A paper describes a structure:
The [name]-1 type [name] secretion system is an important determinant of virulence in pathogenic mycobacteria, including Mycobacterium tuberculosis. This complicated molecular machine secretes folded proteins through the mycobacterial cell envelope to subvert the host immune response. All [name] gene clusters contain at least three or four [name] conserved components (Ecc), named EccB, EccC, and EccD, with EccE being present in all [name] systems with the exception of [name]-4. In this study we report the molecular structures of the periplasmic domain of [name] and the cytoplasmic domain of [name] from the [name]-1 cluster.
In both structures EccD1mt residues 20–109 adopt an identical ubiquitin-like fold characterized by a β grasp motif and an anti-parallel β sheet with strands in the order 2,1,5,3,4. The interaction is stabilized by 4 hydrogen bonds and a cluster of buried hydrophobic residues including Met1, Val54, and Val58 resulting in a solvation energy of −13.9 kcal/mol and a Complex Significance Score of 1.0 calculated by the PISA server. The extensive nature of the interface and its re-occurrence in both crystal forms, with or without the [name] fusion, suggests that [name] is a natural homodimer. The dimerization of the cytoplasmic domain of [name] raises interesting possibilities regarding the nature of the transmembrane pore.
Author numbering:
A (entry chain A), B (entry chain B): 6 to 461
Write the structure that this text describes.
């Protein structure tokens, strides 16, 4: 028996391996920590083919998609264990009423600044250009951060109204995306103007921003707790504070709960459970990871209470409360690819802000569906159809499906409909002109449950 | 403005028209009560084309479907009014969290018997053949009831294991249908044998059975409270009692809550509300209807208490307690059509019991969908596909749909996935042989969430 763990390369993987060593000492079970690039993207393929890790660490947003596809083992910790972690952290790793991972720590981005360059950091994003111009006369810049991952730019986009999926009545609506509204637009435009006026560069990534900050070349960066360890070993005298406002509004970072899921195909699930409950999620376990790269606000009450007085963590939590806990619904992956695309294109000039976000809006609503009711004589049959795709793309196979569904329907209630008959088929509302085939159901203004017929 | 009301022709429509005349007297608003044949089948088509009644009366089972398709207005009685009816009746008219009709009364089938022909009615279905021989010697028969509508045969079909859709933790599973299991077969076979052995006739419908019982030609019938009025005016001395057992188990009638829905296109929604709240659902209103044809155990607490003492209503409730409240899910009507034809065909000998029920099982089960996740490169996309239809029927348009949904996806993530076919498209699990195109997802053992790829 053995445990293979996947964790991101920016986290305390060496510290986690120390917890692994201790576990091995006590049980004979070897633990191997790995940090492959794009592990959150690779996990589905490998997990499905029996090649995945036994345990995967990532922020909770990815785990809904994994769970929906059966990739993660349901977690059944006793109430004694559940009590040891904050309740809102368990909420982050619940999918369809089941717990699907162990929560580890709460992460939010903060503003990190160099006290020697910048004794008083700006309250507002709008101050940055003037500050940069002043700093440029001394061979420095105001602000550098990773522009290749939308995680980092989201706080600014959401500040004046950008949102991912509309939440209400317990539910996220994947048809209602907030990536093209006025707020998101104003946020991204502000970022792109920073680039145009040479206050930032479109190609700046994680390592470039981190090096600039840790070498005293830029006055500010935006990052999470994991980054503090490299800043400590550097010269820099730094603080961690609330993100700047934009148009008077707090920056609203998406908050992640670093979580550990168990592969549903692991041959060693019981050992994974014992490793995480009795070794990792202890004061001693989290200390070993946190000492390598800080976790932020850990989900473990006893240790959280112990670190809470650290001002860097207090600032993490201040930024967290101003932000939003990420959804964990499956469509988050598609949201993130869309926003990533939109930020990168707009920043580089390949697309205008309007065009980038309009496309992202389109795409984040991946395969939204509309339920329609087909009326065939007196028989009604519900169909789930793509909302945004033109009707002509799927009408033929849809008529063939209905044919098979209704084949044993008694003919009295069928109204004489014969789907085997030849035809140029189209949808129509009863007593109305047919819907044009080159439109989607959305284009046609069709709501869930709408009654439709077919006509030839 | 006027109110046009539809109610079934077995109900107290003259009594209801009397409540109508009182409303007209007080308000000047004319009320027209109509009882068209098959009104529950007609309602969707006419309602969608602006020709429906303002108010429709039917058992609650139909109203989920009407509501899903926007044909019913949302009902907003204040709490004072809601407290006047039993909570369980409101539950019956709740669809997706909204009240969609006013509940009027609880209806269950009972056994009705001629006390002069049969002082002690049988406790078991199994007794009926021998009882019928005795009664034939006297020119009479034992039992006659409507065989043309599955409502009346369902209690027997359900006794030893028949069910419509399996229910558990809050939700009905339309993939899990109980129409062709051993219990349902057992029940329906018993019925078909009564007909083979000449204890009943397959052609017997509602009027024939009613006429025979009310003339004193048959010792028993099976019917609901609406029927008692015609027996009262007849010379028959009758009792209403618990249905007989089958294989030692209670007959389980499907219980309906007769309910009044308001048409979403009614130009007179407020008038219908005042009529239903302040005129029908009062002791005086319900009494007027009940005096024409009995309603059963009414939803209005004040009047239900007044009539509870009546042993005919107590027997109704006893039968209701042994049975089950009907689902109001939209799939109910399709279920009913399938079972209707299945019983008629077995009873006539046109098909065997096994083949009739197999077809109704397949017909009620063919509406279901399965959620799958398609992996293209490292990108996952959820699709909602028909569960019981062969994959080949919809694969081509499905691939075309997916191509359109993915066309603005960034390419690094699609990992060189080739969208142009090397011949026939097929689904496959990651790293596994393809699924057979002539099978459904159900045949292939695919559950909700399954990770599939596309291969050619
Ligand atoms: O950039 C989109 C990306 O954002 C988040 O990923 C974070 C992660 O939560 C942190 O733990 C940290 O490692 O940085 C990542 C961003 O580079 C989402 O969790 C992730 O799903 C999403 O793709
Ligand atoms: O036979 C199937 C039929 O059953 C029920 O209809 C009942 C109705 O509930 C009663 O009020 C009474 O009038 O008799 C009907 C049977 O003829 C369901 O309510 C109906 O939806 C279904 O088609």
């Amino acid at each position: 028996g053995k445990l293979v763990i996947w964790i991101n390369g920016d986290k305390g993987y060496n510290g986690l391996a120390e917890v692994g060593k201790k576990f091995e000492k006590d049980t004979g079970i070897k633990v191997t920590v790995e940090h492959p690039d794009k592990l959150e993207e690779k996990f589905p393929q490998v997990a499905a083919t029996g090649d995945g890790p036994d345990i995967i660490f990532w922020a909770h947003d990815r785990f809904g998609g994994y769970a929906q596809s059966g990739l993660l083992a349901e977690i059944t910790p006793d109430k004694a264990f559940q009590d040891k972690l904050y309740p809102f952290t368990w909420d982050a790793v619940r999918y369809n009423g089941k717990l699907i991972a162990y929560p580890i720590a709460v992460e939010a981005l903060s503003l990190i600044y160099n006290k020697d360059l910048l004794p008083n950091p700006p309250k507002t994003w709008e101050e940055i250009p003037a500050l940069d111009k002043e700093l440029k006369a001394k061979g420095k810049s105001a602000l550098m951060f990773n522009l290749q991952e939308p995680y980092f730019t989201w706080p600014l986009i959401a500040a004046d109204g950008g949102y991912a999926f509309k939440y209400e009545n317990g539910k996220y609506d994947i048809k209602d995306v907030g990536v093209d509204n006025a707020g998101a637009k104003a946020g991204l435009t502000f970022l792109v103007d920073l680039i145009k006026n040479k206050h930032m560069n479109a190609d700046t990534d994680y390592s470039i921003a981190e090096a600039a900050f840790n070498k005293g070349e830029t006055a500010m960066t935006i990052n999470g707790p994991w980054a503090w360890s490299n800043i400590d070993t550097s010269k820099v005298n730094y603080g961690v504070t609330v993100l700047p406002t934009f148009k008077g509004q707090p920056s609203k970072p998406f908050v992640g709960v670093l979580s550990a899921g168990i592969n549903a195909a692991s041959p060693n699930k019981e050992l994974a459970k014992e490793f995480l409950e009795n070794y990792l999620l202890t004061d001693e376990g989290l200390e070993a990871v946190n000492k390598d790269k800080p976790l932020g606000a850990v989900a473990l009450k006893s240790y959280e209470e112990e670190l809470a007085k650290d001002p860097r963590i207090a600032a993490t939590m201040e930024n967290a409360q101003k932000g939003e806990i990420m959804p964990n619904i499956p469509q988050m992956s598609a949201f993130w690819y869309a926003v990533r695309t939109a930020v990168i294109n707009a920043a580089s000039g390949r697309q205008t802000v309007d065009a980038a976000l309009a496309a992202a809006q389109t795409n984040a609503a991946a395969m939204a569906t509309t339920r329609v009711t087909i009326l065939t004589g007196r028989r009604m049959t519900d169909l789930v159809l793509p909302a945004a795709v033109p009707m002509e793309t799927y009408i033929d196979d849809t008529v063939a499906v209905l044919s098979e569904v209704l084949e044993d329907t008694p003919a009295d209630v069928l109204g004489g409909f014969d789907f085997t008959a030849q035809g140029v088929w189209a949808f129509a509302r009863p007593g109305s002109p047919p819907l044009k085939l080159d439109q989607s159901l959305d284009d046609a203004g069709v709501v869930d449950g709408s009654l439709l017929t077919l006509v030839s």
